[PDB]
Structure 1
Amino acid sequence: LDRKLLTLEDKELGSGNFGTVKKGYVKTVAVKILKPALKDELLAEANVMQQLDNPYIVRMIGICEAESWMLVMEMAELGPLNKYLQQNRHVKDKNIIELVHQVSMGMKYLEESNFVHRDLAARNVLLVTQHYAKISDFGLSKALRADENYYKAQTHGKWPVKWYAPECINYYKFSSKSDVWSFGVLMWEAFSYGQKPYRGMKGSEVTAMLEKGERMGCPAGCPREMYDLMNLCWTYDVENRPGFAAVELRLRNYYYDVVNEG
């Protein structure tokens, strides 16, 4: 991209030991900014996003090089789903079903495109409107080789364990079905209005919970069929777990049934 066309604002949206995000520009955009191979990760993330064309996935404008390495994408003005919900706890349950269903349409596309996200969390879903969600954060994402059904992580990175399926933790095997597991945690998060999953527990304690067969409980006011769907996403054995075709069709139908009423 051509820096001269881009305009940064002083206030960062988020920061950390990784980098920072800012607002820019005719089209409004979001910019992730570095603070040796953190560039490679960003280029890798840029490479992934370039291949993705879907309404429910944040669309990349491009990458830019100046005082920092910058990834430029379309703006989702309302920001991370988890925070939004925390700040707006009277969002209707129909509207949450709407939002998660949109993530599942996005995830069915990614599944269909044979990409695995590897970081599907409520924090990584951004809101364009109250009624339009997009999937963000493809920094951990991998294209599946033509000859493979999963991505084999060759080392333990800094992993969001509370979002990760047993096969990820146990075998480092990342598939679309691993992302489905995460979708369940994401589902739980959305219906819990941006509560952190497995609160008060270390990652190793979460594994011990799940191995026993213990699951996070039904969020207050979450329809039972949506909690059922979460638990189905939390099938321990990845063979018996649904992919997003099944998951999205479950949500698709339910969201229309819930439209049927009002």
Structure 2
Amino acid sequence: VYLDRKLLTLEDKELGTVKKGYYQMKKVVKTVAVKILKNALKDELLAEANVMQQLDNPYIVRMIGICEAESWMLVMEMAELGPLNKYLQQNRHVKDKNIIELVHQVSMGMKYLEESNFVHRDLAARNVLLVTQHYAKISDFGLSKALRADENYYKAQTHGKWPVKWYAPECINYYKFSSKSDVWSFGVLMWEAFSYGQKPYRGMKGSEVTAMLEKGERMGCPAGCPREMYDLMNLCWTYDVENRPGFAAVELRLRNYYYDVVN
């Protein structure tokens, strides 16, 4: 849906280009985050908007619309607390239960994405945004693909701006991206979250990570991380795609554990 520029006010400062603004609705004004294109790069923004327009889930960032003026602009709902990794780095008092809660929410959004036959392809703590300390949304659908009705993976060709530390072995070895490869990414994300925003595989190059993983080595259990959560991380890092769980199983595992903690 195309938006009316004269109903949009932008802040002069930027968030990272992404800027805060306000979109006049009928009686209220909605605070928005606006991705603005520095003037086939057009087509990628449109691809991203095309994916977000098909998704409707509480744990996924909503698109408001696109506004063509001066620059091209993708207008989305605002998650005020920002990226998960940054938040947790600055808020080390956040408790295990809370982290469980937030990663469970991520798993619910990913369960839905899996059901909708979309692959995210850039799932990481940086692409989970906090509306509140108890409400997480998945963002950044720029690399995301809608799977064909007759296939369970997307085959890339030699993209190189790849977040290798979040990628499953089959992505690196065969360029095959599935909901199962997103599950691998989710394991890395979980590690990141329980590590309060630390980068994974610190100081390592991509090739060294691939080598570490091929030896069967995996990142260790974060300090204070419940062992059941580390076990779930290790399960996400199943080398063999076919044996690695889907998000239905991952979400169910987190759901039960979370409500075991709540009980």
**Structure 1 length as normaliser, TM-score?**
0.96
Shift of residue 24, structure 1, vs aligned partner: 0.9
Query: Partners in 2 of 1:243 and 1:176 — Cα distance?
Result: 7
Kindly provide the CA deviation profile for residues 235-255 of structure 1, in whole angstroms up to 9, marking residues without a partner as x: 001000000000000000001
Query: Partners in 1 of 2:14 and 2:39 — Cα distance?
Result: 23
Shift of residue 35, structure 1, vs aligned partner: 1.8
Shift of residue 109, structure 1, vs aligned partner: 0.1
Query: Partners in 2 of 1:182 and 1:213 — Cα distance?
Result: 17
Q: Map 1:35-74; keep pairs closer than 5 Å.
A: 35=38, 37-74=40-77
Shift of residue 20, structure 1, vs aligned partner: 1.1
Query: Partners in 2 of 1:37 and 1:80 — Cα distance?
Result: 28
Check the 8 A contact 2:123/2:186 in 1, yes or no: yes
Moved more, 26-35 or 128-137: 26-35
Kindly provide the CA deviation profile for residues 28-51 of structure 1, in whole angstroms up to 9, marking residues without a partner as x: 110111229121111000000000
Kindly provide the CA deviation profile for residues 140-179 of structure 1, in whole angstroms up to 9, marking residues without a partner as x: 0000011211000022231000000000000000000000
Query: Partners in 1 of 2:39 and 2:94 — Cα distance?
Result: 43
1:207 aligns with 2:207: no
Unaligned runs of 5+ in 2: 24-29
Query: Partners in 2 of 1:51 and 1:230 — Cα distance?
Result: 29
**Structure 2 length as normaliser, TM-score?**
0.95
**118, 131, 140: which one aligns with 1:115:** 118
SS at match of 1:12: coil
Shift of residue 114, structure 1, vs aligned partner: 0.2
Moved more, 235-244 or 22-31: 22-31
Query: Partners in 2 of 1:233 and 1:3 — Cα distance?
Result: 44
Partner of 1:16: none
Query: Partners in 2 of 1:64 and 1:217 — Cα distance?
Result: 45
Query: Partners in 1 of 2:5 and 2:89 — Cα distance?
Result: 35
SS at match of 1:196: coil
Kindly provide the CA deviation profile for residues 113-135 of structure 1, in whole angstroms up to 9, marking residues without a partner as x: 00000000000000000000000
Shift of residue 101, structure 1, vs aligned partner: 0.2
**Identity across the alignment (%):** 99
Moved more, 119-128 or 60-69: 60-69
Structure 1 stretches of at least 4 aligned residues deviating more than 6 Å after TM superposition = none
Query: Partners in 1 of 2:261 and 2:45 — Cα distance?
Result: 40
Query: Partners in 1 of 2:75 and 2:205 — Cα distance?
Result: 34
Query: Partners in 2 of 1:77 and 1:85 — Cα distance?
Result: 14
Query: Partners in 1 of 2:62 and 2:39 — Cα distance?
Result: 26
Query: Partners in 2 of 1:48 and 1:36 — Cα distance?
Result: 22
1:137 aligns with 2:140: yes
Kindly provide the CA deviation profile for residues 41-93 of structure 1, in whole angstroms up to 9, marking residues without a partner as x: 11000000000000000000011111211111111110100100011011011
Moved more, 66-75 or 176-185: 66-75
Moved more, 84-93 or 151-160: 151-160
Give the paired residue count.
Answer: 255
SS at match of 1:71: strand
SS at match of 2:42: helix
Kindly provide the CA deviation profile for residues 187-231 of structure 1, in whole angstroms up to 9, marking residues without a partner as x: 000000011100010011000000000000000000000000000
Query: Partners in 2 of 1:219 and 1:37 — Cα distance?
Result: 41
Partner of 2:174: 171
Check the 8 A contact 2:39/2:71 in 1, yes or no: no
Query: Partners in 1 of 2:187 and 2:5 — Cα distance?
Result: 40
